[PDB]
Amino acid sequence: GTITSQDDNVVVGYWHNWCDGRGYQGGNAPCVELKTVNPQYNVVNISFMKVYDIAEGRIPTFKLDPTIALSEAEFIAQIDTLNSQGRSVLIALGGADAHIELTRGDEDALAAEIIRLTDLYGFDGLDIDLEQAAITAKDNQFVIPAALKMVKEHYRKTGDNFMITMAPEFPYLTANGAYTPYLTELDGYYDFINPQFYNQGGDGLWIEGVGWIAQNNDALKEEFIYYIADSLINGTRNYHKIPHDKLVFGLPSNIDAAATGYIQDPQDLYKAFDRLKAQGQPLRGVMTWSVNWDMGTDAANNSYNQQFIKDYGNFIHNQLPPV
Template identity: 55%
Template sequence: MKKKLVLFSVGVFSAIVSGGTTVFAADAADTMPDLANKQIAVGYYHNWQAEQGAGYQGGRPADIDLAKINPFYNVVTVSFMKGEGIPTFKPYNMTDQAFREKVATLNAQGRAVIISLGGADSHIELHRGQEQAFANEIIRLVEVYGFDGLDIDLEQTAVAAGDNQTVIPAALKIVREHYKKENKHFIISMAPEFPYLRTNGAYVPYITALQNEYDFIAPQLYNQAGDGISVGTEWIAQNNDNKKYEFLYGISKSFNEGSGGFIQIPASKLALGIPANEDAAANGYVKDPSKVYQVFEQMTKDQTPLKGIMTWSVNWDEGRNKAGIAYNQSFANAYQGLFKEQVPDTEKPSKPENLKGTATQSSISLSWSASTDNVRVSHYNVYQNKQLIGTSNTTNYTVSNLSPDTTYSFTVEAVDTSGNRSTSSDVLTIRTQAGSQLPAPSMPTGLVVKGVSQNSVTLGWSANDPKEEVIGYEIYRNGVLLTTTMTPDFIDKGLMSDTTYTYQIAAVNSSGISKKSQQVTAKTTADNQAEEWKIGKLYNIGDIVTYKGNLYRCRNIHMGQVGWEPDVALALWLKIS
């Protein structure tokens, strides 16, 4: 690995960013891992708060520690660099220094961390004359956060917006040359939706301009519904699960050869992009991983081995489905054997200790002390009377629908990211409480909308009578269960501006669930209904605020804090009036 010099930010970047650029002490984030002779597993990382129901099947991605991403992924792509004007990046939940330390951890393991430009919901639009300014911002992000490269992930209208097709390649060449002078290799990659890779496709100008520069391309082989390829006289759609091998092998050959109407991408620079699970994409998930193995094996037999594999995303790989069942890194586990150079992790986690339980007449809430592992604990398996009943990503689990006055036994085992299982915990024997005449709770009353903003709705309602022994309230948005809260209030975040939502509440106790409350309706404010900027408030991209008499639009998700005022933090806010 090669060193990145941090001295560049002392002089040049003090003129680029208001207030100058913080220069951190040299660390492992100053290295740029070499991918030249490696097969790669690329995983995208979400730089935003996870939301329930965000998946295509109603699941929820995980909030994960960047530094503890499954070691299967040797290229971590951080999503996203975006915003109006010159796009930029800011960690949504930590300081610059803390983020850099996590990058350093991955770099020390020989794993690359690159920043992704764009994304499905971002409109990037650069114009001729902005090449140097854009290059300067990329270099600034490298120096501040330790990024090792940039991934072009423009989608929809952003692909051909403005002068993107010439400005972005030109800027990347400037950055590549900058680090080449320091004897380092800045990684350049792309993740286009595969229809854009036809010979007349919108990504062709990027690939042509960067023909001698790009390190790999990971086409998105998903979310394209009936689009597909011709193999002989047969049309094979991308979403045809019965022809998954034929599609993946056929398109790999087409890219490598530059045939079938596609631009050429050598197999040595081609990573197949597929979703982590069915929540991660509308279609394209490979239900049978053996089909992918067969594609890699056949391409190797053809003497054209593939560069690697890509997935959206590491957060979805560790997420949960709509029913709350963990995906347990099934993608990483399924493809661990894809690359021969992968060294398996065989060390099992430590035994879970201090298993305890609290019983009601129909449920038992379990808790235990966290296990440790040489890499990371992925989840815990929970056993009831020696039968697996569920998994937990935390050190808590609630078992419901039990019989009153009945004895149960429980054990817990820890599972790491490679599937190694710990020794089971000591057995906990516990008895549910005797049955009572406690009825299901009454319907909650007094549900009101206490406040709205562009992206949130605040609800409140009257607490049920303590005699009903309510243990939680279910929140329903537009008729669908959203989450459960312990208190009679809730803030629904991450909503669309100028949009109407309906809500109902149901109370829960050990005997059952109440009827849903009366329905209330709330409408989020429009973009032009700006609130005053506040410290401690979470701002999402597109939020409008007023500050010192001016209007500003949020460019990157962040929490308002001292020093990040809209008139100072130009990377976070764009003045619009």
């Protein structure tokens, strides 16, 4: 089909290639068909491209989990339907226990497999979503950017914008931090970054007049969102610069989706986003782990009832487009 790229605000949601994931508070995340995903998720990230068995070699791939009971052809057709709705479907590279440890020279085969998978399934791009251990494993910092440059150029040749996004854990975005080689090598190739502002416990930043602002402090959630974003979009307070029109604020769907980082009161985000807007630096959207958790249950089997997309969908979609 058609590589479908995004020009306006985004609400990004990850999609699990597995069934019945266990939550941090004992809940459950079903596998769901793509066609079931709320349409306000206009970027949907297939999780994950990885190495399934090292006996198959170093190059990660994607294999649709048959437990999902969705044929190759049907998956393809559901991606095509999303594309017809103006929604992008990315392949997410990495995740926990991905076994991605590439050696220099592997970039050619990696690029090949990205293209093959993209052309097979009709993916619109790829999200770099490496686990902690992978960020600086072997030659990943060289190989992954090298391959992605080659993929971007491949599709630029027929007038297509293969999307590149990344999901760094935010503490790795300090100046000269471990994620910065991905950002610098792919400056001018990446479409937007959706960092994970969750699962980092008490990590945070100090601000004069406010104090220590932690990612796990619910009383200072507005100040967390505002100041971490402000630092990133300006390259201040010892953070690497990601421009506001390419920054998307990554969050847990609910308290089962991540250990920490869930926003108890959505108005803290509305307020933080509107401050960033008022200073001429509106962000590009939000991201969540995950559509499956947004559609999951708590430990007592109560539906989460799509609370994340209800809280943020309209807020984000009804903003002006980016510059």
